[PDB]
Structures are given as C-alpha cells and as structure tokens.
Design a protein around this ligand. Sequence first.
Ligand code: ASV
Ligand code: FE2
Length: 329
Amino acid sequence: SVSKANVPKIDVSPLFGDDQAAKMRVAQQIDAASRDTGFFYAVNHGINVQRLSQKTKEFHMSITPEEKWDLAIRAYNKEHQDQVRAGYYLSIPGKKAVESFCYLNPNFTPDHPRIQAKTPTHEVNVWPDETKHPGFQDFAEQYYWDVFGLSSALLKGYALALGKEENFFARHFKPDDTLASVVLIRYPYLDPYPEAAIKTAADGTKLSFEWHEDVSLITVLYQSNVQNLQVETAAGYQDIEADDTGYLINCGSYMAHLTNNYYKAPIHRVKWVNAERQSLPFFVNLGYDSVIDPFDPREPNGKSDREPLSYGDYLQNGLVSLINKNGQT
Ligand SMILES: C=C[C@@H](NC(=O)[C@H](CS)NC(=O)CCC[C@H](N)C(=O)O)C(=O)O
Ligand SMILES: [Fe+2]
C-alpha cells in the first residue's frame, strides 16, 4: 500500500486574537507539523470557502477562448510581453488538461512605484470584461485581502513556533508591496483523458504534476474534495487527504533557506485523477527587497552561515527553475 500522511488539523483562530498562551499552543502545533511531514490543515480560519469555490467555478466554466487569448500570459500570447505571471494559463485540448488564472497584489497599478520603475516580478493585473463576468474582479480582489489576512495570522504562528516575536515574518508581508499571488486552477474531467497530460513517476504512479518544493515563504491552499496530493518521506510518498473546509498549509523553499532546513519545504506531487476539481493556492511571498537573516534553531547560539537572500531575487530564480523542471503550467 501507499500509506497515509499525518496531516493534523490546527485551529488557528487564536492567531487573530490577544490570548498569548493560546497563540503559543497553536505555534507548537505548527512546529510539530513543520518538523514531521510538513503539512497541516488550518481550520477555523474565518474565510468563506464555499463563496470562493463557487465564484471560481462560475468563472472557469463561462470564460470563452476569445477571452482566454485576451488575458493570456506571454507563454500563450506573444502580444502580451509584460504578462509573465498575471493572466490566463490555457489548456491545450488533447495535450494539456490543467488551466488557470493568476493575479497579483491589486495595489500594483500604473502609478505604483514598482510598476513605474518596471521592477521584475511586478505586473498590473488583467481582468475579464465586467459585463461577461459580473462581480468576478471584486470577488477576486476581496479574496486576495481575505487570504492575505489569514496568511498574516499564520505567519505570526510560524514566527512564534521558531521562538521569534510574532512579527518576525509578518513585518515583511505588507499590502503595499507583497509579491503574493493567487492562482485559480481548474483540473477537468475528460473522457478520454489526454495521455500527454499524464506523467509516470519512477515509482509507477500516474501524475498531473511532478515532484517539487514550493517557491514561497509558505503556501496557503484551498482545494475541492478530490484526493490528489502526495508528500515525500524517507519511506516513499504518502497520500494527503482532502478537506474542502480547511486550508492546507506548507512551507516553501524560502522558509527552508531562512531556517537552515529546520523547517523543510516538503517535496510533494500531484497524482493524476480523472475528476473535475479546483486548486486555489495563495503563495505567500514578501516584498521585492525583503531580506530575512537566516538562523539555525538547532544551535544554542542560533547562528547560521547562510547568506541572507533577497526575496525578489529568490522569487525570480524560483519561478524560472520551476518552469524548467516541471514544464509550462
Ligand atoms: C499548489 C498546487 C498546484 N501547483 C502549482 O501551481 C505549481 C506547484 S505549487 N506551482 C507553480 O506553477 C508556481 C506558480 C506561481 C505563480 N504563477 C506566480 O507567478 O506567483 C497544483 O495543484 O498543481
Ligand atoms: Fe506545490
């Protein structure tokens, strides 16, 4: 058998309040999870996830090929040279099943200083026509701030977990400059299913997306109720069970870096399953100039020999490395 990953459910609600001991008890849980398989479900998070999946379903189901081309990233539309991150990621019938729509900080506007300076990884979001998708852009911008709020709370948990004051991570995660993204991903049911869209792992397992570590500080993921994820352990891959009421949380490689690998970025992969489903990750990224000084929780003195790494640079390299290893999504 493929075994089952232990993915605890952590009530994160005290992270929004002022009961300091209760926050430490949430922190310990985040610590235990981060040192084990590296995944947990955040429960009692305060976000309406039923409204999230609904609005996301309307959008993916009603968008037309015309509109997809209008919103297409550079990978799919030569005319959109500025769209590296934000825009539509098209499926290719017969070949590629997954499709998605990525958007960035809504404060990135033409008169935002990083946009005026043409800084790498900052882009102005593109949206569909309001009349064809009424309320979608309002829904998505508000979602961005909702999951922003949740992530800030989670980062207070991680900071306490590592013995730091609660603002250690969160001080660098700001509405004005955060490079965080939301990706609205559709995995379709297809019959017959395109072979080119299925990968075979060394271990024989059929996959939608190969093994990887996330490019992020942490990743805050909502998915519908179809079991698909696996995490790598010394004993091989273990299945991560679905929970469409919670947020699945894990560390990305920037956390692994900062902590001298004390909190690993868990390697994980996406099994092929022939079922309609949604995956809505929020990648918790900092500001372009954010630097956190690496440290080592194992050492009495906490000292690390690792270089501080600037977030904008880490992100740029990471996104490029991911496309190279696992392909254009
Ligand atoms: C997180 C789940 C999802 N995986 C993925 O999307 C894979 C592995 S996390 N990640 C990516 O492609 C990084 C997208 C970054 C985004 N465009 C941005 O510019 O910030 C899946 O379900 O395949
Ligand atoms: Fe991932």
